[PDB]
Amino acid sequence: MADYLISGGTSYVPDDGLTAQQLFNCGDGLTYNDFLILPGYIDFTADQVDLTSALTKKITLKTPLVSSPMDTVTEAGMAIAMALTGGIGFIHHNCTPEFQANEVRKVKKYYPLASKDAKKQLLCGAAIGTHEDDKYRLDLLAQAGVDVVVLDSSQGNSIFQINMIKYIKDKYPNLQVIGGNVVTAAQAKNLIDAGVDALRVGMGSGSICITQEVLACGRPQATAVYKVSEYARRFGVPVIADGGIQNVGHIAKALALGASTVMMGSLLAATTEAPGEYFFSDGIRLKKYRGMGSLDAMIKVAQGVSGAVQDKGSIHKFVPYLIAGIQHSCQDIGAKSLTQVRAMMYSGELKFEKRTSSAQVEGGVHSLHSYEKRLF
Amino acid sequence: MADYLISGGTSYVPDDGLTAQQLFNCGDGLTYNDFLILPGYIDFTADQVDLTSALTKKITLKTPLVSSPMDTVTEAGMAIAMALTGGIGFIHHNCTPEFQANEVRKVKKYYPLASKDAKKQLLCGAAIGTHEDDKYRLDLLAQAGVDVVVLDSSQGNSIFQINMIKYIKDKYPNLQVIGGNVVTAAQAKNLIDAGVDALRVGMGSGSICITQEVLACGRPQATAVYKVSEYARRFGVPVIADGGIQNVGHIAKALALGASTVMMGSLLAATTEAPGEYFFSDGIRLKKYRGMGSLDAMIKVAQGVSGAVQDKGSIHKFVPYLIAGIQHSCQDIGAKSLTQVRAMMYSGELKFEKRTSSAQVEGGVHSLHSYEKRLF
Amino acid sequence: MADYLISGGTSYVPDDGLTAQQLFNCGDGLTYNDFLILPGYIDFTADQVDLTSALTKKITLKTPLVSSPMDTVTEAGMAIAMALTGGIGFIHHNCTPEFQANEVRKVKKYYPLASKDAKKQLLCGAAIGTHEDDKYRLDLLAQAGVDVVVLDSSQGNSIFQINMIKYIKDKYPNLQVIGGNVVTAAQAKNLIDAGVDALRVGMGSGSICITQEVLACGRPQATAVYKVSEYARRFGVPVIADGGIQNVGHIAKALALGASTVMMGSLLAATTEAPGEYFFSDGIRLKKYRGMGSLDAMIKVAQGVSGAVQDKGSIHKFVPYLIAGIQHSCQDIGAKSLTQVRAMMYSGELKFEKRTSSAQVEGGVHSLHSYEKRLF
Amino acid sequence: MADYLISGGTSYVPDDGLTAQQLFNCGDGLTYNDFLILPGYIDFTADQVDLTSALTKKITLKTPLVSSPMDTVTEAGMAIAMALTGGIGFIHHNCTPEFQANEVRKVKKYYPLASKDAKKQLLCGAAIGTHEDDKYRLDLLAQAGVDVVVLDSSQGNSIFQINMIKYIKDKYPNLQVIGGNVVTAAQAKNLIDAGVDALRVGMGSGSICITQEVLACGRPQATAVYKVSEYARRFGVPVIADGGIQNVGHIAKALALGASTVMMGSLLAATTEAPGEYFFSDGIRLKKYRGMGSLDAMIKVAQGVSGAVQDKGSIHKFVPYLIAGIQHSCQDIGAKSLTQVRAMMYSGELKFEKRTSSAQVEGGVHSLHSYEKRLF
Ligand SMILES: NC(=O)c1ccc[n+]([C@@H]2O[C@H](COP(=O)([O-])OP(=O)(O)OC[C@H]3O[C@@H](n4cnc5c(N)ncnc54)[C@H](O)[C@@H]3O)[C@@H](O)[C@H]2O)c1
Ligand SMILES: NC(=O)c1ccc[n+]([C@@H]2O[C@H](COP(=O)([O-])OP(=O)(O)OC[C@H]3O[C@@H](n4cnc5c(N)ncnc54)[C@H](O)[C@@H]3O)[C@@H](O)[C@H]2O)c1
Ligand SMILES: NC(=O)c1ccc[n+]([C@@H]2O[C@H](COP(=O)([O-])OP(=O)(O)OC[C@H]3O[C@@H](n4cnc5c(N)ncnc54)[C@H](O)[C@@H]3O)[C@@H](O)[C@H]2O)c1
Ligand SMILES: NC(=O)c1ccc[n+]([C@@H]2O[C@H](COP(=O)([O-])OP(=O)(O)OC[C@H]3O[C@@H](n4cnc5c(N)ncnc54)[C@H](O)[C@@H]3O)[C@@H](O)[C@H]2O)c1
Ligand SMILES: O=c1[nH]cnc2c1ncn2[C@@H]1O[C@H](COP(=O)(O)O)[C@@H](O)[C@H]1O
Ligand SMILES: O=c1[nH]cnc2c1ncn2[C@@H]1O[C@H](COP(=O)(O)O)[C@@H](O)[C@H]1O
Ligand SMILES: O=c1[nH]cnc2c1ncn2[C@@H]1O[C@H](COP(=O)(O)O)[C@@H](O)[C@H]1O
Ligand SMILES: O=c1[nH]cnc2c1ncn2[C@@H]1O[C@H](COP(=O)(O)O)[C@@H](O)[C@H]1O
């Protein structure tokens, strides 16, 4: 009897570690490789973990991986491919509107967990601009049959973006929009009261964004995804993480801080289904990678740069490594779903820990003469 | 009279420094080269310090140095050698079971402080897997006559490992098991209540483990050895430190934070008794060094890498330098045994101090044009 | 009237900055380039600042610069030279006792502020070992007529060093001894109650000492000079700073934290009056520089290394730059003597400020393509 | 030598106690019997302490005791009396203007330290209202020859009071005004920039004011005198403490927190020179005592009450006890003048200490069956 009715079910479970709530009000600007996740008790293995997540308030996915809408990372090829592996892709807005019209008609008509609708057609998203000339851009791909759109912007709460939500939802109520870019709760309020359906958190944290050093704005991104998902839980709105993703660990860190889908732009760059084409340098196979703020887009200013990244193969051999990396991580946390790991984080059942620079210099590799970092 | 009976024996001993208990609840993730040990009063010299320590609850050793069970660092050669110098070795589990059966029969049959049993045969340990097919692996080396085994696992508290303790101790009660890998108190409870005999603390902190950056799990290791030895003192269970050992100072830091034996994998790599064989690169004598999580072990994922480390000579000329390095350190702390230095740490008689990055950049070498770092 | 008698003399003087007392109990291990000194009101210029300081409780100097007793930095040449510029030199103990006997007889027999005694002979100090065979070393240079000696030791409070003070002061009461190495208050008590005359604070902080990484002992040095001069003010005992001196700013930081004389070993290395001789490497004029813990001194261990430093000219053109660097610093603090700057620090009239790594990366030089760092 | 030039003059002086600056930003609302003053080194005795203080920026007094302008405490009698003992008195404004005109002409025409001007006539102050009909009140006693006036108001920074300063100082520039009532720095700025000459700090803290419980405004008074004298030191403006004075200890606490003169209304009530006349109750000699906010002044509200206090004798036998009580207190602090004790408080040479309720219940009298509290 009394082994049960002193507490009831729960054992002692000592108090070593920091929950996220007292981790992130310390005032430190945390990024991904500055905290990490402490392990706990497991009762399962790596393959029955239900890795489903939500992109908007209605449509949910079999994996939390989404491509970022730039022309140097995704078009209809990787939209097709990431749909067929479970994820979702967007399409950039620096082309003509008929170009993405044809791009969406290519991806829409056209693998067990392939993320298909009630029409059993593959999910497709896109992204539009913010200026009022894009109203003629928007209704064309609305005629093409897009599912979600992303208001790609450097800062979220303009009058322009709020008027675009109040322009879209009273015209196209079944069509669902993504707000962005939101990085605090203060601008997270003005989009949820606008009525937006999900948020896209993170500015200044990309591989190629220098706008933290040019415009002196933004935030560290792992203290941003936490507080935006903290405010956005109050209304049941999922958030989408941008920037600072370099590997598959940061995926799990963004997923355990409240973000439901992780948006990658560099880690999905230099793939077979990425647009453009290859060129060698020092004998290394690579392809170019640039951002919308870079002046290789078109009295200007530049928030992005233009560089290149070495090849990473086809995505159909790449995203199984990423979902297995999320699955082994969610096993070592101790939750057999992403819903359950966000439950354990909001309740405090898993606990984090800070790092120092001396702590991450041991976290990678050290005391070697040379090494061959082979990932899969 | 009254020079004595105001306090009694103890002098004033001013309050400069931080004891470990208020050092490690600051929430900072400390590693070894981020704190250090402040000196105190000595009354002895470097050679009568009784450097004995405990590996499990029954068998104790003349030195706290133990090799790590990987095939790229130890087999029966360095098992023989480190037994004959005082320490203990394990044997990896990525071979056939008859291979370690012959390996244990080679080391068991076969220098004053040579760590021998009541049969006056040398101590030998090993390590097994976790899956239930390893039951046929376990009883074969139990027939060979192993002393301790290590449940080598990335995370400790599975159902599988707890069922292995409850499978072993009711079959082989004199045989003693090592749990692992434990890194918090929360999983330190589920192995001690399972009935495990010692713990192996530290994940993600090796020279070649990238699982802090791949699976986003683990902990900084010097804030891990402290809290696991804090919880494991409550039941009288010693702990074993893994990873992040680069030199002989980190040995003393792990020993002064409550760990009783320090397990090394890279600092004992590239020795004469390490298996494999040498090959030059840039004219530097070196040999390869890889981990079990690396995919040079055999829909996969990789937590380790495969590299190489330059040669460090025979261990019989190497571990006297390591035990003399522990002895000079234990002299400069002010305790003539490791039992007494852990006593002084749990009571608060020695005190630590944090460092900054600017503090360790002076701690090594600086303001030189070139230097020849000669260790012994 | 009432402009005076509300406070009395003192103006408002706002409360921006941190005094040393609340700076150094934060628990951070501060080194020299991690804090700096905030300026205040001046009423003088750089040349009438009385830069006199104290070495022991009796003999005081016209400058706080003292050479460190190693054979690779000082002998009777730089003893003569630094005496003739104001400072004091010691003589290493890794030679035969007749060698320093002749060395002290060379420097003693033999420029306005030349630090001469009541005999009007130049001041000379030395250093002896700790073992009891050095009693025959000690009385020989006592016969030679040395002024102060330094008990050169890695850690201060042995029984051996305390018995050496109780062996010296009852035999040679006018002869004055230097304790060392002390780094906390806890060992600062056992030498002052032994009756030592000054302290030599700092271990593990040299340019060539690796004993923080080998023996895991020591302390960050700018949090060491503060607390040792804090405890040693209570008995009126000056302290001497070792290690971590790279330039002339760290001189002023050690002098403003309570240390009265700054002992340099690398910044006075590679000079004309340093012993040994020159040799080129890559066409750079340089000479070797090694420590007593390095195994180029003679079952061993090594706490120092052996390297080299590029040439810095004659000291008679070098220490005027150092005393002018202390003078401009003491001008910018706002105290026309070193006694007054330690008064302003113990009272709280000057205030410090922490730095971050991002703060010192701007403190040096940045945003240049190349630069020519010319010091004087 | 070196007993001096390590610090310079000052001895160690340990760090027990709290200076006022870190006492009063704790956020606690301190009153007088909630902190107290720790003693220090003395070098004098109780009678040569120069107890002079300042009332305005020009005229200074031989004692810091000033009566409060109510009709139930002071008129021309106690104005004459407290002038002749050193202090200064004001005259209430709830009479006709010709009444205080005659009152000031009685006190002005008319004992060694008797506070007389360059005309060798006794100092006299008064107080006027705030409404614009009081301009005819003001010039009449300006014709009578008053020295200072007090803008008696519940809250200080009205437009009305600032316009009264800008009405007075451009008409009557030699005439000096007192602002009030100020209780924070926020309203202390708007009167000093108005150009007021001293402040009268404290609202809601009187013996008879209930405006903290009626209007929910004010502040605890000993955390008010500190921060108003903190802001008013920046412009060299003295402040005057009201309310919460019950004895002679609170005088010393208000004087050691930066206030230069202490204004009493109840402790100078029930004296021989107080107006009105006596009446017995329970056989106890007493006289009535009421405030301006009480509706025994004339759609109303009431901030004061109307009561009575028992007799305390003539003031010429009473204020020598008060100045001897300030003198013994200033002796036990360790400053031979009030200017020097405010110097020691702003520099931090004296230190305070908080109390608890359990700490003041021992501070008075306890463990007695009865006691006869005889004051002088
Ligand atoms: N982490 C991120 O996602 C991130 C962060 C920063 C920048 N960026 C990229 O930078 C790109 C361009 O940045 P941008 O916001 O400066 O250009 P934009 O086209 O995205 O936004 C338009 C610019 O003009 C303003 N604007 C919006 N509507 C306007 C209207 N009717 N009239 C006049 N001005 C209007 C906006 O403030 C903005 O500066 C974006 O497409 C985005 O992809 C991305
Ligand atoms: N610091 C360290 O010591 C450390 C840290 C991380 C990884 N590693 C190395 O990584 C190696 C492999 O890591 P690993 O744990 O992923 O492989 P493993 O063979 O050690 O463990 C088996 C894997 O499958 C799961 N498992 C256990 N029993 C199972 C069963 N009956 N059925 C199905 N699944 C079961 C486990 O969770 C684990 O992921 C380990 O041998 C270890 O040496 C070491
Ligand atoms: N910052 C510094 O100044 C610093 C710090 C560390 C080391 N060092 C250098 O390192 C040198 C050598 O270091 P060390 O202290 O190990 O050698 P040492 O000769 O200075 O001291 C003797 C060693 O044996 C022990 N000892 C002392 N008296 C003994 C006795 N009668 N019998 C037996 N043992 C005795 C001491 O603990 C010490 O380890 C020192 O000369 C010092 O210059 C300097
Ligand atoms: N600790 C203290 O000293 C203290 C604190 C509170 C109240 N009091 C006493 O309370 C007495 C009355 O308090 P009070 O301030 O309410 O009355 P008041 O006569 O002192 O002030 C006039 C009142 O009307 C307002 N006022 C000022 N000028 C005005 C103007 N031209 N036209 C219209 N309104 C104007 C003021 O806000 C105030 O409420 C005061 O005389 C004061 O002595 C003293
Ligand atoms: O030009 C740019 N300037 C700033 N941010 C950009 C730019 N282009 C793309 N981004 C953002 O950077 C993210 C990709 O960052 P990554 O994870 O480092 O690849 C995208 O999802 C966008 O939100
Ligand atoms: O492949 C791996 N991935 C993660 N950790 C490993 C791996 N192989 C060995 N380890 C751990 O790393 C430790 C050695 O770390 P080292 O002290 O840096 O050499 C071993 O004791 C193991 O616990
Ligand atoms: O061999 C050694 N090991 C550790 N410390 C040394 C050694 N030799 C000299 N030192 C100390 O290092 C100081 C010089 O440090 P520097 O200021 O970096 O040159 C000397 O004053 C000695 O106290
Ligand atoms: O009627 C009133 N209501 C609120 N405060 C008053 C009143 N009358 C006088 N005061 C203030 O109370 C102070 C006297 O407080 P005491 O020190 O307790 O006697 C005077 O100096 C006035 O500032």
Side-chain angles (χ1 to χ4, degrees), chain A residues 366-367, chain B residues 67-70 152 181 200-211 241-246 263-268 289-294 303-305:
Chain A
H366 61 84
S367 68
Chain B
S67 294
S68 66
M70 291 89 78
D152 189 42
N181 281 109
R200 188 165 75 93
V201 55
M203 59 176 286
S205 66
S207 65
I208 52 180
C209 296
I210 52 182
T211 188
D242 277 336
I245 283 92
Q246 300 181 3
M263 185 178 293
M264 298 181 289
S266 69
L267 193 59
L268 291 175
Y289 179 66
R290 58 102 179 272
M292 300 296 106
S294 181
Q303 302 186 5
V305 293

Side-chain angles (χ1 to χ4, degrees), chain A residues 192-215:
Chain A
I192 293 170
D193 238 7
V196 81
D197 205 6
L199 292 175
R200 188 165 75 93
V201 55
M203 59 176 286
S205 66
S207 65
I208 52 180
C209 296
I210 52 182
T211 188
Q212 292 185 0
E213 83 74 16
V214 177
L215 268 76

Side-chain angles (χ1 to χ4, degrees), chain B residues 1-9:
Chain B
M1 287 294 108
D3 55 353
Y4 179 74
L5 70 152
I6 195 164
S7 295

Side-chain angles (χ1 to χ4, degrees), chain A residues 208-211 214 290-296 301-307:
Chain A
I208 52 180
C209 296
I210 52 182
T211 188
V214 177
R290 58 102 179 272
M292 299 296 106
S294 181
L295 74 159
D296 290 335
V301 73
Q303 302 186 5
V305 293
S306 176

Side-chain angles (χ1 to χ4, degrees), chain C residues 13 16 32 36 54 56 76 82 89 105 121 137 154 166 174 196 208 239 260 272 301 309 322 327 353:
Chain C
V13 65
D16 180 24
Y32 294 105
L36 75 116
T56 1
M82 291 189 72
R105 292 181 63 87
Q121 293 180 357
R137 188 180 295 272
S154 69
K166 302 194 299 295
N174 54 2
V196 81
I208 52 180
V239 297
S260 66
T272 305
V301 73
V309 285
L322 265 70
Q327 283 181 354
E353 197 14 14

Side-chain angles (χ1 to χ4, degrees), chain D residues 24-69:
Chain D
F24 286 100
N25 37 0
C26 296
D28 290 331
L30 278 308
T31 195
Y32 294 105
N33 51 6
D34 203 3
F35 71 99
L36 75 116
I37 298 165
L38 268 58
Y41 183 77
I42 75 174
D43 55 352
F44 58 93
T45 183
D47 51 358
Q48 75 272 24
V49 43
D50 194 2
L51 188 135
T52 182
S53 139
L55 185 66
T56 1
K57 284 174 95 288
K58 265 65 186 299
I59 52 100
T60 62
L61 275 77
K62 298 289 181 68
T63 188
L65 275 69
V66 49
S67 294
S68 66

Side-chain angles (χ1 to χ4, degrees), chain B residues 18-220:
Chain B
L18 298 172
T19 67
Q21 185 178 3
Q22 76 262 19
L23 184 64
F24 286 100
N25 37 0
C26 295
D28 290 331
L30 278 308
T31 195
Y32 294 105
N33 51 6
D34 203 3
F35 71 99
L36 75 116
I37 298 165
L38 268 58
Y41 183 77
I42 75 174
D43 55 352
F44 58 93
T45 183
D47 51 358
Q48 75 272 24
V49 43
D50 194 2
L51 188 135
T52 182
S53 139
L55 185 66
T56 1
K57 284 174 95 288
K58 265 65 186 299
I59 52 99
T60 62
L61 275 77
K62 298 289 181 68
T63 188
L65 275 69
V66 49
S67 294
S68 66
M70 291 89 78
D71 59 356
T72 327
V73 46
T74 180
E75 280 186 350
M78 139 154 18
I80 282 294
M82 291 189 72
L84 286 161
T85 191
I88 183 59
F90 295 133
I91 284 95
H92 64 93
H93 63 86
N94 59 359
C95 59
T96 64
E98 292 85 2
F99 189 80
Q100 5 187 0
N102 195 6
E103 248 6 350
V104 172
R105 292 181 63 87
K106 283 174 92 287
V107 63
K108 186 58 69 180
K109 293 190 285 186
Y110 183 68
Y111 66 95
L113 43 97
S115 72
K116 61 180 73 67
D117 62 353
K119 184 65 177 176
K120 278 83 70 176
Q121 293 180 357
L122 310 117
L123 281 235
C124 173
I128 60 173
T130 268
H131 298 91
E132 64 317 21
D133 57 355
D134 302 325
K135 298 180 187 294
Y136 181 72
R137 188 180 295 272
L138 191 271
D139 53 354
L140 264 293
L141 81 154
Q143 189 275 128
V146 83
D147 291 329
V148 291
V149 284
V150 176
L151 295 169
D152 189 42
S153 299
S154 69
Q155 189 188 3
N157 54 355
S158 66
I159 335 102
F160 309 105
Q161 190 165 352
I162 298 172
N163 286 121
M164 284 193 98
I165 279 103
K166 302 194 299 295
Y167 178 75
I168 287 168
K169 294 182 74 68
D170 56 353
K171 286 177 94 288
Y172 294 153
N174 54 2
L175 182 63
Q176 298 182 356
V177 295
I178 307 300
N181 281 109
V182 126
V183 85
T184 79
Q187 60 265 21
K189 183 179 184 292
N190 296 114
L191 293 182
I192 293 170
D193 238 7
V196 81
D197 205 6
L199 292 175
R200 188 165 75 93
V201 55
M203 59 176 286
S205 66
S207 65
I208 52 180
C209 296
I210 52 182
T211 188
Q212 292 185 0
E213 83 74 16
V214 177
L215 268 76
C217 183
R219 201 175 181 183

